Amino acid sequence: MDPVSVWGNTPLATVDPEIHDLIEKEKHRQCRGIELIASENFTSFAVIEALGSALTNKYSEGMPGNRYYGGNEFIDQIENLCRSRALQAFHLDAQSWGVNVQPYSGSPANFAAYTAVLNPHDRIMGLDLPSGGHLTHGYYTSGGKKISATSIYFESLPYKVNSTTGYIDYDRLEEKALDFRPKLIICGGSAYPRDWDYKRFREIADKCGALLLCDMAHTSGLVAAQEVNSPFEYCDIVTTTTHKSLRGPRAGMIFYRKGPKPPENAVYDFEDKINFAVFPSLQGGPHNHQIGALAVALKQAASPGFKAYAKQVKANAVALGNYLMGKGYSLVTGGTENHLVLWDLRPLGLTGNKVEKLCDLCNITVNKNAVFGDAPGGVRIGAPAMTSRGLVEKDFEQIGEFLHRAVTLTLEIQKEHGKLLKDFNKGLVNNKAIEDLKADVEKFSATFDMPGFLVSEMKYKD
Amino acid sequence: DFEDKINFAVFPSLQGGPHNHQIGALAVALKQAASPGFKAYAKQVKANAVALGNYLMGKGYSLVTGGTENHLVLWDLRPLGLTGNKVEKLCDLCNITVN
Amino acid sequence: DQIENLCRSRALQAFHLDAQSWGVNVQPYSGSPANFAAYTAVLNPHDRIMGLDLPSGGHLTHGYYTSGGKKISATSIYFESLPYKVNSTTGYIDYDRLE
Numbered sequence: 001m002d003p004v005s006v007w008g009n010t011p012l013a014t015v016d017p018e019i020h021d022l023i024e025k026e027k028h029r030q031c032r033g034i035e036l037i038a039s040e041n042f043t044s045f046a047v048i049e050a051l052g053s054a055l056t057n058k059y060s061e062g063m064p065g066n067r068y069y070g071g072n073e074f075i076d077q078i079e080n081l082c083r084s085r086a087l088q089a090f091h092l093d094a095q096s097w098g099v100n101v102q103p104y105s106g107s108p109a110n111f112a113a114y115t116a117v118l119n120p121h122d123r124i125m126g127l128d129l130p131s132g133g134h135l136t137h138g139y140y141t142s143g144g145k146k147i148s149a150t151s152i153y154f155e156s157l158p159y160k161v162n163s164t165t166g167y168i169d170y171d172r173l174e175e176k177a178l179d180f181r182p183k184l185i186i187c188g189g190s191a192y193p194r195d196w197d198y199k200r201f202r203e204i205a206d207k208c209g210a211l212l213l214c215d216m217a218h219t220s221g222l223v224a225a226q227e228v229n230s231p232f233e234y235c236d237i238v239t240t241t242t243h244k245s246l247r248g249p250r251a252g253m254i255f256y257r258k259g260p261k262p263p264e265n266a267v268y269d270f271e272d273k274i275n276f277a278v279f280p281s282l283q284g285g286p287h288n289h290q291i292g293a294l295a296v297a298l299k300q301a302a303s304p305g306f307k308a309y310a311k312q313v314k315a316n317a318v319a320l321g322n323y324l325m326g327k328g329y330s331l332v333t334g335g336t337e338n339h340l341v342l343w344d345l346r347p348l349g350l351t352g353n354k355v356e357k358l359c360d361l362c363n364i365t366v367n368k369n370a371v372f373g374d375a376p377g378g379v380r381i382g383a384p385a386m387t388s389r390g391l392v393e394k395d396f397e398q399i400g401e402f403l404h405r406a407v408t409l410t411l412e413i414q415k416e417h418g419k420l421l422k423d424f425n426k427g428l429v430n431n432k433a434i435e436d437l438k439a440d441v442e443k444f445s446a447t448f449d450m451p452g453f454l455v456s457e458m459k460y461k462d
Numbered sequence: 463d464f465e466d467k468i469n470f471a472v473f474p475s476l477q478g479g480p481h482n483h484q485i486g487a488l489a490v491a492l493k494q495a496a497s498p499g500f501k502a503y504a505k506q507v508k509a510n511a512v513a514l515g516n517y518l519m520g521k522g523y524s525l526v527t528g529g530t531e532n533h534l535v536l537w538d539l540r541p542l543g544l545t546g547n548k549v550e551k552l553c554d555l556c557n558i559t560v561n
Numbered sequence: 562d563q564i565e566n567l568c569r570s571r572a573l574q575a576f577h578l579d580a581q582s583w584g585v586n587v588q589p590y591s592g593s594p595a596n597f598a599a600y601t602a603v604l605n606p607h608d609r610i611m612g613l614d615l616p617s618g619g620h621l622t623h624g625y626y627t628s629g630g631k632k633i634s635a636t637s638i639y640f641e642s643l644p645y646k647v648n649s650t651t652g653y654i655d656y657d658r659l660e
């Protein structure tokens with residue numbers, strides 16, 4: 001039996017050189033490309049120190065002051081701190097809003113919210129995936145195969161954007177809701193480049209008797225800084241991830257109205273149902289290292305610096321958008337009001353998969369994305385991650401130039417090898433233009449700061 | 463065609479007699495710089511600058527370019543609302559000489 | 562002569578230079594005279610020069626004139642200097658704007 005220090009106190013670089021080396025290679029990759037995945041970010045070292053800590057050792061099933069085991073003196077304080085900081089970050093009165101901070105991620109947070117307020121097979125609507133919505137808001141194929149757990153255990157129906165403007169068609173949503181009669185309407189999405197008319201959603205929900213939930217995962221950092229419409233003014237429940245624009249660990253939260261209802265002396269009934277759904281119905285012990293790390297992120301999000309970050313994210317998305325748009329490219333809705341742009345590639349005859357593939361070869365990470373609701377004909381581009389490395393508008397205009405080069409090279413490989421993926425991949429090999437672009441992206445990326453670790457100590461600096 | 467132009471610029475164009483005590487002292491310094499100890503000194507200078515830079519950033523101080531690849535660190539004091547004048551003056555009084 | 566010849570040869574050795582490819586002059590009184598003699602060797606009066614801007618980390622002898630147009634460095638008095646700057650985001654040399 002190994003003495004404690006050999007297995008238990010030796011650092012990772014010695015206990016497991018393989019994993020240490022792979023993480024170091026991943027750190028280097030994060031420092032040598034252009035990260036435009038709109039859901040990604042780079043969190044702080046202080047968050048990561050809480051995440052990688054002894055908090056992982058403690059079981060604390062239940063919730064603070066009402067646990068199933070002992071030894072929770074300090075875990076209770078950490079969870080209570082995290083919860084009160086969550087309410088502060090979003091400027092919520094603790095007598096009108098509560099929050100559960102135990103969900104393991106955003107998707108468990110959504111499914112626990114549904115479990116709390118719906119019965120199995122109850123009806124739900126959310127934004128269609130080709131229109132910018134997320135899997136957890138419901139998804140089934142044309143062949144009827146239920147894919148999302150939301151569509152397996154409840155009855156979902158999507159609403160779409162207008163096929164010519166790309167904005168949410170609020171009239172068709174109201175009509176569909178009166179026909180379908182959902183018990184729950186979901187707003188928020190993954191690839192919608194505009195703000196949300198939450199007042200209109202509330203009017204539609206009240207007209208059809210539905211609860212109204214906003215999944216604010218993508219824009220939660222922007223909501224915290226009061227840079228986009230606040231869903232809390234109008235929604236019954238607000239779910240979120242904590243790792244996207246909020247820049248924290250991977251976790252989820254469920255916010256819920258409490259107290260008297262606005263004008264029978266009726267009161268909200270969400271609190272106990274939401275808490276019970278997370279535990280004991282769906283989850284086990286909370287991940288206390290995530291909760292501690294989340295409390296750190298929420299304190300960082302409440303700071304004047306984070307408000308400046310949120311402004312800069314929106315400004316960088318706009319500058320990138322305008323740059324592409326001055327090159328003659330087409331954006332869905334012709335611009336953005338948030339952290340992302342939707343690049344309609346169809347006027348170029350390119351699929352989003354070809355542009356995504358050549359970009360990845362040049363260390364530019366984007367993702368194909370269906371466009372206007374229609375082989376995805378676009379790509380989604382987000383600003384939070386590279387903004388966190390300190391990039392401002394001119395730097396995002398340089399990102400725009402890099403994207404313009406990558407797309408030109410894609411056209412060039414298509415106009416020489418052909419629109420078939422078996423043919424197109426022939427041009428992606430031994431290609432000096434790709435090799436050059438990659439080199440330029442690498443040298444560009446290396447000039448920027450990186451939160452989360454001591455840069456001078458990284459193993460790979462080439 | 464640099465050699466003749468450069469030698470001529472130094473003398474007779476710009477300077478008078480060389481300072482031969484400087485040249486002899488410089489010859490000594492160039493012998494010392496060619497030694498394995500000096501290679502280790504130069505590594506140590508770099509390591510010392512990095513270690514100081516990392517210490518300051520850990521306290522929440524801002525370095526220009528966020529680090530160093532050579533012998534110096536540049537410390538941006540504007541985020542603290544301080545001028546270089548005040549910090550230089552105060553620790554000149556504590557026998558710490560910066561600029 | 563032997564001391565200067567030794568200084569020159571040790572200069573070439575300390576920087577790992579082939580004497581068929583590199584020569585050295587070791588008489589400059591200091592660094593500022595060295596720079597100004599180099600300029601005098603290869604430039605005519607009023608020839609154009611660029612060096613790193615002083616707020617971007619450059620040195621007086623690389624050129625310096627004020628917002629008001631006052632020529633401070635002798636480099637800017639006797640030649641026509643224009644500075645280049647670091648990238649305002651990163652603090653590294655902005656190579657594209659220099660080009």
Ligand SMILES: Cc1ncc(COP(=O)(O)O)c(CNCC(=O)O)c1O
Binds near residue numbers: 059284285286
């Ligand atoms: C048999 C078994 N299976 C699954 C789980 C769930 O683990 P998570 O907390 O990671 O969700 C538990 C937790 N049991 C906790 C206990 O016995 O104290 C368990 O005992």
Ligand SMILES: Cc1ncc(COP(=O)(O)O)c(CNCC(=O)O)c1O
Binds near residue numbers: 477478479480
């Ligand atoms: C009148 C006069 N002025 C200036 C200088 C220049 O001195 P430096 O070498 O220190 O630059 C000399 C040198 N004249 C040397 C000689 O007559 O032998 C000089 O004779």
